């Protein structure tokens, strides 16, 4: 009990090598129809966080910093590769030159906890239930900003917990130094982000979670979710379903911040189950964005990494799957190696059919466009169960991403749409703890 007595300080050795190659369907390209060199690197992250306990039970602070080092990289590779840091050091002033290595100080926050009431401000990542996120490579991007929230404790009849965060900053893991929010324009200044947001808890495997954010004077955002595990024939059926919509305040649907016509939204439906040692997944999206955009973000500045926001459907197959009218079904399974005697280990695979995905609808584009795409992936994984590198994980990941047009990549209207594409992603990852 006490600021040192409980401290924690743990660490991190992070690897990670990716081959990515995609097809060039300019016409008049050199490359015409074939796949070339978009992403080559290795790059290793090392990462070191200190974690004291409560002083009088009721303020601590957290400090934490990481490290990029690059290790080999192609003349093709393209930037940011966002686990190395960006060669420009704020999201504003991003000119995809290149890449480089160095450390930034991604936690540093005040925490307080009396009570039923916590909170933590500083350079912080969002632990509620709010709609905001912060971006994910190895380390997590941070705010610069507070949070604080409560829990409602009803017993046996259940638990509300609700939650409030606000930051001014924000700073991606690829980059070292926070930036502004700004609008769609990269102009104009967005003062704030915040949100509130809550959970329900029945403690009956029935989970209720809802939460609205706002970009200050531009864009508003909701989410909720209703998560219940069930049996069917004895076994754990997971089951969830999800909304998220956004909506923007510019009158004018030609001004280059205008986003969306009215609301856009996101909505999902996940089913899980676990038979002996196969774990299925199966889920399947809809999309409507109307707008300058087409397609539904779940971040409120538009901007690539200028923030991030919550969204728990991800199928790991390269496409977000989230254009205008899109709809799209994800189905996959890993099976655990355990009865093979391989403890730690598991091989999966995961295909996903889109249709009906259909362009921004400001009027230079064709309307009348249908695109389609799909993908298919690999996994293996495998925990270490030895003792010295007790806990590491070693991950392969391949991805074979199939768009059935020849629009050449991000054109047509489809802005967040690319050609097809393989990937090949190598990771480790091997914690330690100091004291
Ligand atoms: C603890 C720990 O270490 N890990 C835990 C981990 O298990 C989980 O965390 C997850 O980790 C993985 C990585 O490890 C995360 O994976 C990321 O997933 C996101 C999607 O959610 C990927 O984001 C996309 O990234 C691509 C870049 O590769 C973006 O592509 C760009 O998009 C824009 C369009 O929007 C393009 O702009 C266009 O540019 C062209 C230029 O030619 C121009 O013509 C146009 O004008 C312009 N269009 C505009 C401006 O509108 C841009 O060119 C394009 N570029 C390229 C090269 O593609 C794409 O937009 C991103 N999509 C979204 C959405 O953001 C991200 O790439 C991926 N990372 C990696 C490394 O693969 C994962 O997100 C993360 N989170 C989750 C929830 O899983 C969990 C476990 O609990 O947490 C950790 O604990
Ligand atoms: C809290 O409310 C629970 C959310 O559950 C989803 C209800 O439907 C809302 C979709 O707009
Ligand atoms: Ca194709």
Not at 38 to 55: E, I, K, M, R, V
Request: proline share 3%.
């Amino acid at each position: 009990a006490g600021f040192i007595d409980d401290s924690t300080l743990t660490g991190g050795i992070y690897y990670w090598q990716r081959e990515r190659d995609r097809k060039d369907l300019n016409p008049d390209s050199k490359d015409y129809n074939q796949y070339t060199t978009n992403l080559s690197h290795s790059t290793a992250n090392l990462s070191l966080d200190f974690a004291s306990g409560y002083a009088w039970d009721m303020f601590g602070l957290d400090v934490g910093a990481f490290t990029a080092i690059e290790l080999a990289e192609s003349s093709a590779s393209g930037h940011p590769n966002e686990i190395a840091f960006s060669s420009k050091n704020r999201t504003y002033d991003e000119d995809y030159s290149g890449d480089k290595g160095g450390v930034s100080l991604y936690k540093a926050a005040a925490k307080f906890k009396y009570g039923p009431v916590w909170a933590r401000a500083g350079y912080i990542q969002p632990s509620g239930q709010t709609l905001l996120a912060p971006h994910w490579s190895f380390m997590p991007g941070t705010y610069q900003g507070a949070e604080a929230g409560a829990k409602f404790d009803y017993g046996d009849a259940g638990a509300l917990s609700f939650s409030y965060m606000w930051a001014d900053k924000y700073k991606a893991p690829w980059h070292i130094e926070v930036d502004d929010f700004r609008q769609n324009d990269k102009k104009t200044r967005v003062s704030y982000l915040h949100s509130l947001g809550a959970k329900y808890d029945f403690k009956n495997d029935l989970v209720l979670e809802a939460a609205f954010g706002q970009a200050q004077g531009y864009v508003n955002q909701y989410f909720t979710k209703a998560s219940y595990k069930f049996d069917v024939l004895g076994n754990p059926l997971t089951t969830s379903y999800q909304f998220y919509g956004a909506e923007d305040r510019i009158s004018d649907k030609n001004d280059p911040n205008s986003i969306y016509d009215g609301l856009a939204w996101l909505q999902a439906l996940t089913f899980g189950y676990t038979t002996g040692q196969f774990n299925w997944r199966l889920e399947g999206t809809m999309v409507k964005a109307e707008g300058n955009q087409g397609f539904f973000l779940q971040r409120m500045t538009p901007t690539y990494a200028s923030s991030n926001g919550r969204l728990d459907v991800w199928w790991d197959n390269r496409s977000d799957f989230n254009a205008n009218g899109e709809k799209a079904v994800y189905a996959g399974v890993m099976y655990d190696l355990s009865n093979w005697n391989l403890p730690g280990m598991a091989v999966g695979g995961s295909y996903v059919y889109a249709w009906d995905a259909k362009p921004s609808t400001n009027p230079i584009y064709d309307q009348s466009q249908r695109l389609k795409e799909s993908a298919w992936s690999l996994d293996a994984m495998y925990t270490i169960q030895e003792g010295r590198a007790k806990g590491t994980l070693i991950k392969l990941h391949y991805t074979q991403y199939d768009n059935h047009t020849n629009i050449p990549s991000w054109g047509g209207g489809y802005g967040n749409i690319f050609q097809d594409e393989k990937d090949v992603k190598f990771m480790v990852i091997a914690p330690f703890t100091i004291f």
